[PDB]
């Protein structure tokens, strides 16, 4: 199993090698062909590595009164778009290479979904299970101070985000620390971090963001007859099964949104075991059973499945757990028609090459796992705007809709002759429910769906334009590299 | 031919002399009548001249290794609204008087279209044809640095713009230089300049901005029966001909948008000759013929017209070329019913006085040439917002429209008794095309049209309120002076 | 040969282990003995590692038009005193571990000479011999920009300095870049870097700074009878010989200043060979011979010495060349009574342990190589003051001295009875020369000598207080650790 750094390097190298010929041809400036070739190679060389990596060593005082030195890292991959964006991970396994690779991955993911952020990633080398709430808060605030002093945290410079190991309370601590010490005179101080709770400037709909993004990315390619023909399927969600690996937030919400639109789930596996029921599994039953039992084992409405969760006889495989689980050990045995990677880097390059032969579709995490990033961009915009979405427009649009219905009613009675005849003033039950429960999360989900659809169409266009098959990962990486190169080329690189 | 400085001074003097009587009467504060008269005279005296003019002399190193001293100027006319806005012109003919006059013109143009910018203008005394791309970039970056150090460039202070002689690449250089050296810690650094390419924070629809503004300003007065009666015409665009002077971006886009709405073009003239075809000229044919041939001469579908392009037997004359082309030499020979000035100051005051006698309508460049300024304001707002227009609302409004259509369908079947009867769920072909191709440029063009309509109505109201005839220039200048005086008076002038 | 990182770690560990018992005892606050022990251990643990390490990857455009990615690092060891201070090294061999070790060494060196700077070190992974002047300037300016954006360059944050591989022109480039882009609004922008040329705010006397510091550190221990007894010598500089390893700036100036005060040199060795003359070698002859011949080989007034320069039958060995040249391979053969380390880390710990047995004095580079740091502190102070030393006081003190002499003359004639008798108005030839040639370098050298004397006395006091013998390195490290601990303890560490 190659490391994520080498994986990202290989993906970028392949994408750049594919895209360079077009990058050279589209240049129409007053130089020679070989000068254009060298310029394109040079800009790619500039883009590939991380620009800034900061290693930190700061002290904290333990609860008992002892002192501990904490090691932390933050890598900013690209500054072609500011601010940089990236999560903070609290783990003993964090490393400079890992944070650099994840920062590069974030850079390329933001480009795919047209989010104007650079890539970043931070890691603190602690095990949070061995610290109290007070000590964790002290660590978070000291990390925030040290990063802010060196220009690695800021609303216009670098906006961190939560991870699996960090949460909304950590983001609250970061925002509170920045807004009160370093960014006190900055009106956008609370835009320095996303993933905040609602009372701290968070955005509505962030909880189901990644799951909804996974669902939208799945459905965009599901409703595509051109790819459905090669995969041997039918358009729509009918007669389709899916399984999820890991039942975290991403997997749970993806399962719920897939079950909503008519798809049925078969089995749900984790590291502590796996459930299995071919007739359909209810996401709410799984949710409340897990909420009570602390685990998924012992579900009375399903049974135990032997072997890995990746080899079930299903249609769509959705891994939302530990990464690099798809490799040559189990790649030729999965027998899953579509692979929907809800996690970052769950498929090795050799596994992907195997799936290419077997006509197996792999939807890259560059595109599918970008819903949370889009909603974080929306939250950052909301903090910049200092108002929630729809606050000044919901009642106005409601009045406009009522006026439109009234106009239709009067016109219908006036073509006729009536006073109380045809009544096209009644909105449908779904429309009335939408009107009554109109909130910021509706706008957020609408924007997320729009972003997912646009990105899917761009990826498809790139795939057909470069004669690519079912390897959507190559098309997505090519698209991201093209966008980043365009920004670099039309801006200039050196000011000296 | 009087200089543009004297022309602007005369326009302002006439407008102030007309508007002063009303400016005095509407004042309802606790002073005397003569004190009010003196206060109004005083505020007009304050408004008339430019506030700040900066003369620059900075060095560059040539490609061969020699050094050259570059002279540049930037004039900020008014600071009653910040930031100031104005273009940068690369020409040997630039001068302090010219940049001051153009800054004043920009101040008065922004007021007409309700754009909250002061007026500004910059000029660099070089001939860009005698420099390479590298040397031009060095000149642009050094000019940006020198202006930024003295508070003459900034998102909240002064936002430059392109001209005919400068372009999107120059704006890219300016934005890149400012965002990396002086405005590095400013979150709105890229709002320091407009006219940027799309990848650098530019706005969609800027290319056709001035042409669309010219078309909207023409159609606003075309659809006005009160003025059509005095001009002896019919409302609408039927049985109307137009010719353009110069086939630049402004003239080309104005011709295209006029041809779209049913108007027919007769002849297109430039400095290298003129084409002529009374039966109709196709803008796309002209566009691609010019793109291939580098000029307009030799068009197989039309013939040569002798004499100046300003004396054709047409209905609407649209000069979009060098200025001061309408003067006593050719004023009584033009025989064009309406003059639509798409360029800055193409008519001399004596020519305008001649057109007043001959019942010839002159639409001022203060109003007609303000589409680019409005779209630049939109681009500045987009940079401040850090998101493109419609990103969070397109899908939401699409869902709302579908729900409205569904409500109408169900209500129609329910007044009736049907399940699949009347089907008012189908949007029209034009509506469906608008829904499918909904983008930021649609919002930009909608805002531009709204601004043009509001400005046209305000100008008409001022014209009828001050007993003015077809001299819309006087009405527009009076309106701008009134707005600027209102801002000055309600704010106060001296803080000491 | 262990690496410099492990060497510094071992030196710090030994010093902390020696000093901890006293650090605990002198604490008189309201806690328990074991709490004091843990607090001291904890502060030492905080002090030991580097606080911030920044890894950079920035592009430059080559002269031929190609692009290259440059890797650079800057490590800030301690922020207990701001700004941090450290040199910039242009070499292919630079590494994160090396820059961290050198930053720690700088932290401990500044404490010894009471210079209020933290330690820092920067390295750029290029070979300057393979670049032109223009490319080197581009690299320097881009490095300055990248460091300044991340808070790693600044008059109050971090002040870089030259190295052997970087020079006054590089410091000029750094100062010019910072003062014009990021620190434009900072009145102390030119204090961001030291080692500048005179016309750029440099200080007089920097050239001979390190050599004069080496001479002063040597003479302080030479004039100490208490150590002279154990070494079996006589106080003064009579009947004393010295040899230098490497004839760089440090070695040349140390040789010149030692020859001035009556000491005689025997041989001068480098990597290209070695000269040898037991009867005395003239520093000016060596200087101009090297200036003409580009090397030291072929000196007509001396002969070739076989073997290493470290094993000559002399009294004082002064290495001013590559580091780690003293080790077990040649340690028991040197036969040099006193070792005066003018270079950073030229003696390995095993070599030092060997010299301890053989009653061989080793003067640490922590103290002896700190003259340049002191003069850099003086230059930083001069830039902050915006005036050269003595500008407002030289003439005043000259008038005061003349008045004192006149007072003595009149009093002598008035005790006597005379008008033109005793004439104590004539200053000596040396005093008159000092008065006539009074400049800033005299004040700089006076301050350097004062700093060296104070540091030597403090080191001696620590050595006798901790029962240390001739291992002055341990005493110096103990003194630096004590000072840093005092600052940390009396300030506090965590603000949370």
Author numbering:
A (entry chain A), B (entry chain B), C (entry chain E): 6 to 501
From the article:
To solve this bottleneck, we developed a cryo-EM support film using 2D crystals of hydrophobin HFBI. The hydrophilic side of the HFBI film adsorbs protein particles via electrostatic interactions and sequesters them from the air-water interface, allowing the formation of sufficiently thin ice for high-quality data collection. By testing six different protein samples, apoferritin (480 kDa), glutamate dehydrogenase (GDH) (334 kDa), catalase (240 kDa), influenza haemagglutinin (HA) trimer (190 kDa), aldolase (150 kDa) and haemoglobin (64 kDa), we show that the HFBI film can protect the specimen away from the air–water interface, solve the conventional severe particle orientation preference problem, improve the quality of the cryo-EM micrograph by forming thin enough ice, and produce high-resolution structures of small proteins with molecular weights as low as 48 kDa. In addition, we found that the HFBI film adsorbs protein particles via electrostatic interactions and that the particle orientation distribution can be regulated by adjusting the pH.
To test this hypothesis, we studied the orientation distribution of GDH in a cryo-vitrified specimen using the HFBI film and explored whether its distribution can be regulated by pH. We found that the orientation distributions of GDH changed at different pH conditions from 5.5 to 8.5. Finally 162,042 (48,499 for side views), 120,274 (14,013 for side views), 149,320 (37,812 for side views), 120,149 (73,256 for side views), 82,340 (52,545 for side views), 88,585 (60,808 for side views), 174,836 (126,218 for side views) particles were selected. We found that without the support of HFBI film, GDH always shows a dominant top view regardless of the pH conditions, which is significantly different from our observation using the support of HFBI film. With HFBI film as a support, we collected a large cryo-EM dataset of GDH at pH 7.5, which is close to its isoelectric point (pH 7.66). At this pH, GDH particles exhibited the most even distribution. After several steps of single-particle analysis, we obtained the cryo-EM map of GDH at a resolution of 2.26 Å according to the gold standard threshold FSC0.143. The cryo-EF analysis of this dataset gave a factor of 0.84, indicating no strong preferential orientation problem. We also calculated the Rosenthal–Henderson B-factor of this dataset as 76.0 Å2, again suggesting a high-quality cryo-EM dataset. We found that the contact site in the top view is highly positively charged at pH 5.5 and becomes less charged with increasing pH, whereas the contact site in the side view is less charged at pH 5.5 but becomes highly negatively charged at pH 8.5.
